[PDB]
């Protein structure tokens, strides 16, 4: 009967748990205890980008570390020249309910999506001077949470229908459907080799997928609320997660369990965005309490604070050259910190 | 600034001139969110997103319904949430009262008011006059409940219907008075399927919502 099959799951769930405790000979805190603390990180707002007339839900940097894309509920994508604070483009959107935005690695395309269940791809640089829709990708039965590019014709999306999808934009149809989550998927991060990606879902689980195959290689369960953010370590062998339980956690792919927890009794608000620095020594997380925190990723000690926003900090990014950090908030502003 | 950087700056100024112009059109439209379980007649009141536009007294209204604990954070800056409840199907009123509690007590909707249309007050009249079904089986407190003598706006209807009516309204207003802190209000109405006065009631309610926003800008309330 179904009880026999359900009994085998409990056997393995304790076999994985047992075989995972055979690897915890020491903790990350003991090993990195005798390394000098980073210090106090004093970052000042170098730019403020004005022009959005509603809340900002997503931003994404460019590989050139100079251009970035921003999404807002006013229904407009703006591409900014962060050095000069100029507006390169303003892209009107069919739906005002935008939750995600991606900037293609080549820079030719920007993606968007949200409550319309459609990932819309935009051709930035083309004749006619203007930005126009190249493809509307349909097929998800829930809202679109995050989208990231692997190539000009290769994109991964996460939706509230408990699934992630791999698309071919030239064909316009799903190539792989990643199934295995029992709740909405709120974030995903792409490995630096573009051969793996992690997904954080509202079932308090994080799953590592193989893009070429379409399988869930590992499942990580250490949180206790919805996972809202996720980000790979620069090495590609670890990732950090952010949850509504006011904790950031570090997970190792090779050992396959959690290495560190970033909590503090003063913080009781959830984490909206998470990001690493170029070397991995700093973990930056945005919070609902109007401000952002900078943690030491090896000693778990707070290393500073970025307090400059008048509402919820919704997005957070670090440039590929590590020169700048950009935050966005529901107060309709972006800020470049250095 | 070079010749090209100067020309880029002038382009950036013209994008602003159009962002603000669009913001002016955005400021004069009132956004609403429609909620309610199936069998609520939700889509038949003003007679994954289905936008609906109606205007009353030269004021533009804009209604969205999604076809939820996560995406509800998007609608943190709406004028009102319209909650539509069938007052006839006594089985699922508990689901309606629990649906309403979670929306009222939600962290991102702490300053969003709720307009409460109780659909199918004509079907309720049938079930309360026919006698086959009784509220007391589903809500035990009905038996020990007496109609308020003061609150008697009942024009030409049986006191049995008005007892049945005002009890269902209490079960929703009490959830609103429990944990509200005065920052947001619930407005309870009573609408059938042939009701045509609906667009006005949303309007007359939004005019009060906006008044209470201005009384909080000037520290008056």
């Amino acid at each position, epitope marked *: 009967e179904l009880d026999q099959l359900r009994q085998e799951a409990e056997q393995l769930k304790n076999q994985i748990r047992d075989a995972r405790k055979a690897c915890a000979d020491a903790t990350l805190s003991q090993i990195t205890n005798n390394i000098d603390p980073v210090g106090r990180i004093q970052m000042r707002t170098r730019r403020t980008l004005r022009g959005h007339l509603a809340k900002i839900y997503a931003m994404h940097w460019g590989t050139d570390s*100079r*251009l970035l894309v921003s999404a807002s509920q006013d229904g407009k994508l703006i591409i900014w*020249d962060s050095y*000069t604070t*100029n507006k*390169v*483009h303003a892209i009107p959107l069919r739906s005002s309910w935008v939750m995600t935005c991606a900037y293609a690695p080549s*820079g030719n395309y920007v993606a968007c999506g949200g409550l319309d269940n459609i990932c819309s791809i935009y051709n930035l*640089k083309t*004749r*006619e*001077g*203007n930005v126009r829709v190249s493809r509307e990708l349909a097929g998800h039965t829930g809202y679109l949470s995050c989208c990231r590019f692997l190539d000009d014709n290769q994109i991964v999306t996460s939706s509230g229908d408990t699934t992630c999808a791999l698309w071919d934009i030239e064909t316009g149809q799903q190539t792989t459907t990643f199934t295995g989550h029992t709740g909405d998927v709120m974030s995903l991060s792409l490995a630096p080799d573009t051969r793996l990606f992690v997904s954080g879902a509202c079932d308090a689980s994080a799953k590592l997928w193989d893009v070429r195959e379409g399988m869930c290689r590992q499942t990580f369960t250490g949180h206790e609320s919805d996972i809202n953010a996720i980000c790979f370590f620069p090495n590609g062998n670890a990732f950090a997660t952010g949850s509504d339980d006011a904790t950031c956690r570090l997970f190792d792919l090779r050992a396959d369990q959690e290495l560190m927890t970033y909590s503090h009794d003063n913080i009781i608000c959830g984490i909206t965005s998470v990001s690493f620095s170029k070397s991995g020594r700093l973990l930056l997380a945005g919070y609902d309490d109007f401000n952002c925190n900078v943690w030491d990723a090896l000693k778990a000690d707070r290393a500073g604070v970025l307090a400059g926003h008048d509402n919820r900090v919704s997005c957070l990014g670090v440039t590929d050259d590590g020169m700048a950090v950009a935050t966005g908030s529901w107060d309709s502003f972006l800020k470049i910190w250095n | 600034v*070079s*010749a*090209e*950087d100067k*020309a*880029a700056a*002038e*382009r950036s100024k*013209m994008i602003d001139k159009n962002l603000r112009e669009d913001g002016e059109k955005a400021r004069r439209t009132l956004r609403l969110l429609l909620l309610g379980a199936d069998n609520s007649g939700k889509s038949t009141i003003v007679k994954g997103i289905f936008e609906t536009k109606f205007q009353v007294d030269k004021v533009n209204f804009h209604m969205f319904d999604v076809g939820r604990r996560k995406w509800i954070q998007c609608f943190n800056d709406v004028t009102a949430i319209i909650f539509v409840v069938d007052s006839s199907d006594y089985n699922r009123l508990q689901e309606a009262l629990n649906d309403f509690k979670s929306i009222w007590n939600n962290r991102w909707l702490r300053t969003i008011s709720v307009i409460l249309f109780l659909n199918k007050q004509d079907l309720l009249a049938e079930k309360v006059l026919a006698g086959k079904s009784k509220i007391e089986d589903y809500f035990p407190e009905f038996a020990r409940y007496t109609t308020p003598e003061d609150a008697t706006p009942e024009p030409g209807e049986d006191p049995r219907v008005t007892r049945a009516k005002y009890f269902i309204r209490k079960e929703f207003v009490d959830i609103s008075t429990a944990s509200g802190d005065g920052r947001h209000i619930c407005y309870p109405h009573f609408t059938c399927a042939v009701d045509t006065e609906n667009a006005r009631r949303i309007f007359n309610d939004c005019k009060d919502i906006i008044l209470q926003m201005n009384l909080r800008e000037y520290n008056l309330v």
Partner: single-chain antibody
Amino acid sequence: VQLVESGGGLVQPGGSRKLSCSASGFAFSSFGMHWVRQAPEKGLEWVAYISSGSGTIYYADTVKGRFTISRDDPKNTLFLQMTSLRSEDTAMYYCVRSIYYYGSSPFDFWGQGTTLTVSSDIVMTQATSSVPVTPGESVSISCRSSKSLLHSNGNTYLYWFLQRPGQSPQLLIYRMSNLASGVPDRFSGSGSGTAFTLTISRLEAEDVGVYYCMQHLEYPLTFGAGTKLEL
């Protein structure tokens, strides 16, 4: 994308004319439009510029005070009104669209022009004037300037143009290094301030003409004498 011009024809000295160009195929309003003329046998000379929104207008000193530039955004048409024409105002007038933002390619499209037959400054020089070359062989075209074209923001504002016989000029290299859209990868650009070169590796036919180098550092926009390549 098209830029078709009207007007032209013989005009007596001291007269007036209104040259007009019509756009069809691109967002004409988001583009700045230039006027560049070319005497019957001389090089390219820049006349006027009107920005998007018409909020910025520049003229060359030759035509200042007596030529007026204007645009009609709803009708997609660019104008140039003449007053007190001269014997030095004889040329073929070209219409150029230019778009300015970060990473853009200005001077992309040139419309085939109209012929009018009326009956300090950054001087920058192309020392060579004619290069007789063999097909398939790499050729190098070099022009220099009076002052450095390298700005404080790292952009070297120099543009390379090509004019095939009986054809409008088109863009090859913008900002000393960047190829235009549709240009073969055999073209290349290099140089420092006041020293520039254009290398055409693996030369081929349909690539012979007069090569122009322009500065965009500041107005007036100064072109070069023009180095032509013949078989």
